[PDB]
Design a protein around this ligand. Sequence first.
Ligand SMILES: NC(=O)c1ccc[n+]([C@@H]2O[C@H](COP(=O)([O-])OP(=O)(O)OC[C@H]3O[C@@H](n4cnc5c(N)ncnc54)[C@H](O)[C@@H]3O)[C@@H](O)[C@H]2O)c1
Ligand SMILES: NC(=O)c1ccc[n+]([C@@H]2O[C@H](COP(=O)([O-])OP(=O)(O)OC[C@H]3O[C@@H](n4cnc5c(N)ncnc54)[C@H](O)[C@@H]3O)[C@@H](O)[C@H]2O)c1
Ligand SMILES: [Cl-]
Ligand SMILES: [Cl-]
Ligand SMILES: [Cl-]
Ligand SMILES: [Cl-]
Ligand SMILES: [Cl-]
Ligand SMILES: [Cl-]
Ligand SMILES: [Cl-]
Ligand code: NA
Lengths: 352, 360
Amino acid sequence: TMERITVNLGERSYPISIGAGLFANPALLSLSAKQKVVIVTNHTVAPLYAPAIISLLDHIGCQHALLELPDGEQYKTLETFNTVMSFLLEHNYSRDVVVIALGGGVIGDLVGFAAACYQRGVDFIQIPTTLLSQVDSSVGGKTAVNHPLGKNMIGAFYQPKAVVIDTDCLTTLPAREFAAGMAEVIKYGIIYDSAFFDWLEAQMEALYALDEQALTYAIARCCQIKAEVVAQDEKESGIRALLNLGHTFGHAIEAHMGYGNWLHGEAVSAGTVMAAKTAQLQGLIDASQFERILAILKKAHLPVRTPENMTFADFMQHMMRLVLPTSIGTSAVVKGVPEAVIAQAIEYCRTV
Amino acid sequence: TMERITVNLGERSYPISIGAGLFANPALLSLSAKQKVVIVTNHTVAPLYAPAIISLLDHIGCQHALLELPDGEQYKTLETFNTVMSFLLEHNYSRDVVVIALGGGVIGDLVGFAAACYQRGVDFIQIPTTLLSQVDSSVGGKTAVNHPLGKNMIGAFYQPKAVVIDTDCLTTLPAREFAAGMAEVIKYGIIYDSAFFDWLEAQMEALYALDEQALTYAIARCCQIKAEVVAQDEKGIRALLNLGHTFGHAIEAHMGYGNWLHGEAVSAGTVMAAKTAQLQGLIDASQFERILAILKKAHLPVRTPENMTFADFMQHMMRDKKVLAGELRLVLPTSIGTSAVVKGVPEAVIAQAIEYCRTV
Ligand SMILES: NC(=O)c1ccc[n+]([C@@H]2O[C@H](COP(=O)([O-])OP(=O)(O)OC[C@H]3O[C@@H](n4cnc5c(N)ncnc54)[C@H](O)[C@@H]3O)[C@@H](O)[C@H]2O)c1
Ligand SMILES: NC(=O)c1ccc[n+]([C@@H]2O[C@H](COP(=O)([O-])OP(=O)(O)OC[C@H]3O[C@@H](n4cnc5c(N)ncnc54)[C@H](O)[C@@H]3O)[C@@H](O)[C@H]2O)c1
Ligand SMILES: [Cl-]
Ligand SMILES: [Cl-]
Ligand SMILES: [Cl-]
Ligand SMILES: [Cl-]
Ligand SMILES: [Cl-]
Ligand SMILES: [Cl-]
Ligand SMILES: [Cl-]
Ligand code: NA
């Protein structure tokens, strides 16, 4: 009772296992008893889910070790990366070591990049534990760390050997974090799959109730969508941009409200609404299409209104090309949208 | 006169251009006006070749910037890597920036790793200015930086868009560094190609006189050989490139930071490996002598350091590497042009080889 997606990358092809109680199936890890595994997680996730993974490794017969990094985006740095390197080196780990990234997107990116650079690359397995990481970190191979002068500017494209997603870990995930992740779930429906959007409209209640079947289906379809978006980009470099719906306006909110105030997903929600209205003002979608987009984000308990104290100037400050929906299920990168239209989109969204 | 070698790696195929006066040909860079370009070099090489390169960028119309890292292996660290990230970020460079690595192997590896990680990968052009970097770094995709607990343990496989080798730059390379480079050129002859070894014996003096034709052929041949070894390793054979490194690292570790150049330790290491091979019957006496003779002709050290005992070698080759008696593993020549990885070489044979090399 679980779905499995296979990301096509030839030699790098891997499986994404998504289901309930998966942390009990040792065969999803694909490891031999001779392999030495190192679980890298943070101080919060460790006591919660490390034990399940640790028991999974003992059944197989693997020799293991645990490394707990400090919890927080402020620690997604080169220094913490170095902590992973130092650890791997002081315990004499070879290029055959298998690294398991157990945690949210912060751990996924940092440990993934750590895995990419150690002796020029060692196998790693993702075990995302936030809704956002499960639907975004699982595909694309992006890994990174921050620099004082810039976020996610140091990194690499590195694929995992496997990705294990047990929908049960979401139960301990804080309400806001879960909602923040729905922003991304909803995004896929808007930009690429009309049928999936309609399904989301009907199953929101069930998703927020943490219905097993609904979660599994939702996460699985997001991973497929992103996998196809990325597969196309290798043929014609351009469609992967579509994944940035709402990020332009969103980034401006986060940047202005101070990082950590608004979660990224909440900022993406309001940005998506602003993008949709911009689309409507440009004639790319109609009134009722906008209303369906607005209504679903509201149903997902996400912010949809322009922040009370952000002026149009504040947005331009961080904004100065946009991803706009062209219907519910289709989108496009639109170039040359007049400031006036953007301004009116921003102002209009104070009424939603 | 110019040789061009295409390194075949599918979508990531790149050209290696080798010749005299290549720094006067802007076409070799494949750049465009207004394209952002950054030259990363060190304080020593900058005043010798940055102006030439900057001249090409100005001709083309590129907006450029220069980063001068400190000269030294001690600086090939993750923090210096961070300094390149900082430099790139303070200039607000996008993924369209082109990074030029101008210098020896230290710059090649570090800037290469920088190019690999900045915004997850930007284009970099490699302009190796030492003989060793020209014949060992131009092919292989290896980039890395050191960690206090391990040399070259943090890095990535990242291919350059192009490699430009202007043989004129060897004119300013210190005699010692040039010779260290030759230890690697000779390496290729010993382990993979008999004809090239013979050719090296015949033209060694021309090479030291910095003959343009000789330099171009020698460096082009080394790049071709490595390109084959590497492509053949994807299908093991690449490990044969470590001829002498075991004995070599023992010398480097014992003698201390930057006392002996890597190529120097490799040369004496190669002679010890060759002798060990002779005693095991893997090569004959005359073959050992041609190896000894060509390394001396290249003005390289070929003897066991006088102040270093057998026990000294063993503490590094065995004790520190957790290699117990009967477990030594060494790449040994099996003739002039072939080699193999040999294990279980008795310590008594290595012991006498080390002793015999005190007076070769
Ligand atoms: N690589 C990619 O393609 C990609 C995509 C999207 C986001 N990201 C990155 O991901 C990061 C954000 O990820 P995030 O949103 O998961 O934040 P996060 O990783 O900080 O996780 C949020 C918080 O929840 C805790 N947590 C995680 N799982 C939990 C659980 N099951 N129960 C209770 N608490 C739990 C963590 O300790 C953390 O405090 C950003 O740095 C972003 O750049 C990367
Ligand atoms: N990536 C690979 O496959 C590979 C292969 C072999 C070595 N390496 C690395 O290369 C590094 C050693 O490289 P190296 O031997 O070139 O040392 P290096 O890069 O330190 O150069 C030696 C010295 O020559 C100076 N120099 C360079 N070009 C000069 C010139 N034209 N004129 C005057 N001075 C010049 C440098 O400033 C330096 O002082 C090591 O860290 C090693 O790990 C990498
Ligand atoms: Cl432990
Ligand atoms: Cl934080
Ligand atoms: Cl508000
Ligand atoms: Cl400058
Ligand atoms: Cl000199
Ligand atoms: Cl060694
Ligand atoms: Cl003999
Ligand atoms: Na032989």
